[PDB]
Subunit: 296 residues, 6 copies
Amino acid sequence: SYYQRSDWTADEEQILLGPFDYLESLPGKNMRSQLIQSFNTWLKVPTESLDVIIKVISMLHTASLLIDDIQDQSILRRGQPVAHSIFGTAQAMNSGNYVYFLALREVQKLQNPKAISIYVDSLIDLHRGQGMELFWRDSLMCPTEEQYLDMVANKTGGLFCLAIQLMQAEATIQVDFIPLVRLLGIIFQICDDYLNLKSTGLCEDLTEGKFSFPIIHSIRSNPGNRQLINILKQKPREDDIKRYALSYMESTNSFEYTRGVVRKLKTEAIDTIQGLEKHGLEENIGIRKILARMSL
Amino acid sequence: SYYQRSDWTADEEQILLGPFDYLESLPGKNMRSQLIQSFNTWLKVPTESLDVIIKVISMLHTASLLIDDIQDQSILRRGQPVAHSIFGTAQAMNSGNYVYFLALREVQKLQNPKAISIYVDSLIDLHRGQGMELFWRDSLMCPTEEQYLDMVANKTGGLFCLAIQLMQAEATIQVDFIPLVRLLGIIFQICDDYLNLKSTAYTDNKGLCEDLTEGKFSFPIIHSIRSNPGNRQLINILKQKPREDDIKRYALSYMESTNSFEYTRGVVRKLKTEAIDTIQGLEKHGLEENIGIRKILARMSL
Amino acid sequence: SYYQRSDWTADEEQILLGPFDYLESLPGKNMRSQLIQSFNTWLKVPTESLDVIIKVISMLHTASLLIDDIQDQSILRRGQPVAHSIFGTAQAMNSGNYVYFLALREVQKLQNPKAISIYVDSLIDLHRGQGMELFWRDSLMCPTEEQYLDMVANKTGGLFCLAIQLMQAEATIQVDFIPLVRLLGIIFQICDDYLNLKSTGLCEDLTEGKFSFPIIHSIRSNPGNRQLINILKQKPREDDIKRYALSYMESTNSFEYTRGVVRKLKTEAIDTIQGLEKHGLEENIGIRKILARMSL
Amino acid sequence: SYYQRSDWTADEEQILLGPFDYLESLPGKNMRSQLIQSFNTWLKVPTESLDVIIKVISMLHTASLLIDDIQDQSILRRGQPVAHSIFGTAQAMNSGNYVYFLALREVQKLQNPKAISIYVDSLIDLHRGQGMELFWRDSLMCPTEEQYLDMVANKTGGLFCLAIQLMQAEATIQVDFIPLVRLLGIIFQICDDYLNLKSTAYTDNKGLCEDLTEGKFSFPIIHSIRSNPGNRQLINILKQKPREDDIKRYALSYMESTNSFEYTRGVVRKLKTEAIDTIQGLEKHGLEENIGIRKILARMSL
Amino acid sequence: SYYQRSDWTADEEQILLGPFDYLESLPGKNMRSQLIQSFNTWLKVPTESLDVIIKVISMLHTASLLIDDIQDQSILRRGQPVAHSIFGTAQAMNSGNYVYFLALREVQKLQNPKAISIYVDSLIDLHRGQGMELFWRDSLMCPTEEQYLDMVANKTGGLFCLAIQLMQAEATIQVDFIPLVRLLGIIFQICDDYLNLKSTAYTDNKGLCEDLTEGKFSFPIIHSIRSNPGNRQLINILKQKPREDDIKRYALSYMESTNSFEYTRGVVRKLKTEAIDTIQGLEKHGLEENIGIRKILARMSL
Amino acid sequence: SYYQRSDWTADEEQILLGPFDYLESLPGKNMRSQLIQSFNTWLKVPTESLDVIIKVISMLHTASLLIDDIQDQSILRRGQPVAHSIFGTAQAMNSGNYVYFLALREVQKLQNPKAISIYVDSLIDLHRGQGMELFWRDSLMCPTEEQYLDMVANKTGGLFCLAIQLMQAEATIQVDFIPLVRLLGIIFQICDDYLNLKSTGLCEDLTEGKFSFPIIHSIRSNPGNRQLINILKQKPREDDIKRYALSYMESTNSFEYTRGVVRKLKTEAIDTIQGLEKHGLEENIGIRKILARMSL
């Protein structure tokens, strides 16, 4: 009687989604979507469910950008200012975790008894990946390549795998695509690492102190030289430190090593793609295109 | 194959849970699990289900402390360092949101279909309340008391309501206890606001007037700001996020001049009366007299 | 006997006027002066007094730059470093307030019983304007256009009006020019706001968190979007935040809105100028030129 | 018309005066209005004029505290937060200079033509003294004692001299009291310098040795620096602007080793003797014996 | 000629030595010059040579405090400000390395050719130990206890060993005392590590647990970190370099739970027993019983 | 028995010399070496000793760069990032002071009874010079030209003189070259000061607050203007402050004054060089080349 509970208003949603709406208004390379499209060539998910899945994955992806940019302490995002440099850390963080749960509500629309478990297991894999990455960063402990790949499997596989698993759960065909999906996420992340250092901020991964795939190679290629790992500790904003690091990683042949690893991995994926097709699946051009987009 | 997927190990769980386990080992008031037990006098949920519910609510509560101490830039927690000042904010944040989803997995063990929707709706309300509170905070706009209470109902209420709705989902009695529990969450939050400013117990556990340092528009702060809009001293103090004891001291003195601490006591007094009436009303409809719930209401007092 | 009061020396003046002499040595757009010249076409102030007034207004103008640059936390001034980044905050502040009172001593040379009251009322209007502007800035409270204009009347009218009022007090003609003078100061300030965002630091008003005329328009044009007002709170030094804000203000048509307001205001001034001339005043080319200088 | 000029409102005055009103409500020593009253025994200015003078001098004094606390980067004021740490420096600064001109308007009410020139010359001296003090401060050059006293005569003296010159302008007696009042302002400032370092009353009101934190070349600091130029410890401490109590403590200890606090007492002793002689001299020329002025001199003592 | 070379003056020495002289005037424990005197019972170095040795070792010790307080970012030293917080780091650093070479010049006065090589080898060991300690520090890698003891032998041991090797070079007795003195330097450093955390005497002289603020992997810290690798709380605290007393307090509490302070006492106990055996062994070979050396061993104790 | 002293390993040397090895891997203008070569035309030091001396001087020079960059708070070094911005202050400092003593061990290889005294006296002169320079900087006390030159004699003469003195101590000829060596170091330092402000970071000496030769001239040329010395106090990172200072030093004719001083000093050196040659020394082309390299 003294307290009268009010309904939630459009204006309040608008406030809560400010950081989220901002990010969504920035053009990006929409690739989770193309990945969904080219797996749908095989899975043929009914349209009403595919739209639900696409919206769930868009939401989760954007929400996790809000959070990752805060936790990585990035400065740019699709070339425009990072969401929390407009709205502040707290509202960006909370906006993104809010969207995690709007997405779960959206997922409930599949009215599929397995969809909740699929969502939970992905979000758990997500944070498990991002947690091991923060652990190495904060401890200055360089992982092995193998350790890095298991982490990437979790933390970039998480949403890749989430999308395809939901599609699988809504489709009639019972082929297991997840191993291939996980490969593509690993390739995607390794390419990302490479492009962050070699492509037209300058090497934001160095500023953030991240043990990325080529940085790992360079540090371990000659553990007697501690210049690179010490640069990571400094978390350098300066272009002159970054340019020096870049140059040292050239001397260790680490960009050549990464290119050859991506080559080896694309070859496994094509081989795998051909396996599924030699077993009664339509030839998939769209997925070969996706895999060509990653190349460097 | 080049990639050889591996199993998650206990050593890795331990890393992921470091911040959470740190917080979990500092002693707390356990209001929430005592509130559950008082309601279980009426709802009589079996032990197996009730352990799950208690575990889910305490996972979610610790998790959100992890996150809220970061977003509030708090310094102490249970009179000990905030988790993120040991582990850093990134890992403290990630561990906290990780646990949100460990708790979702945990509530699946009820194999109750209403349970997922209850969980979803409550996490949503949590973030809605927290989101409006940060909005006023960052914009320097003082809410009305009514707006404050709507937000508290979502933020603090959302987790009280989650605990009792899960119990209701696990019980066959068709009484709605949620209004009562929501009322208790408001009373609890207003008491918390008052104590953040007026007690050596909380001033030893979170700092002298940490709500001032954070710039939070709490219940007595709102009252004192709005009771004399021509004086901007208090809201300017909030803008400054003072760590100094002298500013906080002056602000506290100012709020006594506005009779705001008395105003709050009076409000809490009216709400607790409403709470007792509600309890007595439920009991006048077949329920046994509930001493535990009277004792938890009591232990929210000044 | 133990204390012997010493005279004030040229060397000490030189110290006290260091920040002031520095600013005066930087070329600027000298417009208070042209405004005085083109009103003198009508007022014909005797030369000895006009020189006193010109010196008083030069002093006050430069002194208030010393102070405004500190209070706004600017970084550049006429392209060169801001006075307090050479001399420090305290000496720049004190140098400027010192000059306020040297000017009052200079004003006493008019030996006009009204001149002191005119000076006091202007300096009061000055600080009243700058105080409401700090109040909105520090409180994140966006004023209305109407509120902003009353503030500008006070805080840019103050020295405009001061100059013309002294001239009026020293002249024989009794025409009231102040309403027109105040209009011109409002036009001058709105143009300044526009030029601060669209012209060749980049949008120093965003860094300073100022509710300027186009920013006000943009914020209020769509109060459901809080991106701009939140950028103001951040007080951004980064060019990427400023560029984004700039772009958002384009989308709200706020530069088009400001241009049309300045158009409307120039038309009132010409109309007013023509009124005074249709009542026995020389046709004033110089003031029409001044008003053309503001255009955008 | 598009522009519709509006009147200044009381709500707006209140904003403009927030910092000033804040300071004005913290209790002070009221040396200045007591000094005026002692001189009024001799000058016998009518109440109406004397209220104006007292109001002008207290407006100007509060205003310049607002400004000086910013320029000195002070932390406390009358044992309370500095105005700018509630209101921010911009508004605190603007409000302070605003009041300078409210006071100019206020002194116009004497309708005394000498009054404007007196006001102008004193504000000029104020800024000249403050300006030399910042110059030594920022350049790390220690003045001589003589230069220090010239600057104090302008800075602290300028506002004592303003109060008594306005009274002289409102009186027909043709005695010059300004030399005496200037002497009193020096004594007052030297006492202030000593007490900033040597008293729990001022160390509770402005902090432990706040003059050190600010880097001010005060009277005992100058003496101690110059008495042994081969030791640069003290002047290097000034350069550092220490907030830590340990540095300030060490510096205080150093200045005792230089007998600087004794040196100051001795100087203050000589000046107060000169002050009494001057008073007795004025009284030996027709003026009634002035007990009040003897009591204010007394209450400047250690 | 345009350039007219000039002589170095006492005024300039005084500047160069300001930081050094500041430190030199704060009272210390004088362990090192007492250790020299105890060994001189056996080595019986003439007074003239022994004064030189004592002067060289105390120059080098003060110099390296100057430098180590900067590199460790220490706050207090002998319960007084660190030299560089008066003089700034540049001058404090330069003065300290200056003195390293004044001491080299000073040791030349022995006109002993072994002396230069002894000096060189010890300064080398100093920097080797300090260098490994910063390496672990900055990399966040906890050494093993064995690696810690190797580093301590170089860093703290290097200056004990320097003092006694110079004495050996000035004596004709052909006994090797260096193993014993190195052992004493380890015991001394482990005691220092323990006391940095567990005594109001050292907590009043260097701060509450200043080793935590600095991130140093000291003896009990290493033990406590390594005794439970699954808990990363302590090493994460080191990473944070906490100045707050609450974090340091929690970390201290954590290390008690790991029984690390007991572990250290036990280690120090074993080393002191080894030290006594060594002494007794040397004495069983012609040397007179040495009470002084037993008393300095004693005064390293808890 | 409980403690077992371990030997020092290559891996540990590698750690301790990390900052040092880094610096040595950056190309620099190798001039201490050319100075040694062209004095060896006269001194003809036996090869085995000349190599020892060269290594000692290389070590000391690089080590003192590690330290000076920390104490000056520089940011660049031979165009690449400064050593302590990779390794941190403490390890760079300690790496450099370690090398001081490795060099002393190296010097012992000359097995020359005088070499230790020569080393000590140079290192003392070094720190005496750098100490007076920090004293003026930290006290804002502008030295006289004459004071500055005595300081430079110590702090840039120190290693110049050290090199030639060791060569002298290892050579058979007994000519005293030190006065000429000291002249060349003074010329070298004055040229350095000039080039730091006029040459293609921008005026790092202003950022560091250094009283260099032209800055000294400018400040003292008109002590009534305190703009330059106040810029020094600010230690400006901004290019706009530096550009303004640069311009003010132009107006004081201070770069013209420095060029004329260097002219006067080169003329003394040539005159001195010709003296030594008119007394039985080979004509030295190499040293005239060195002296031409300094020119501006």
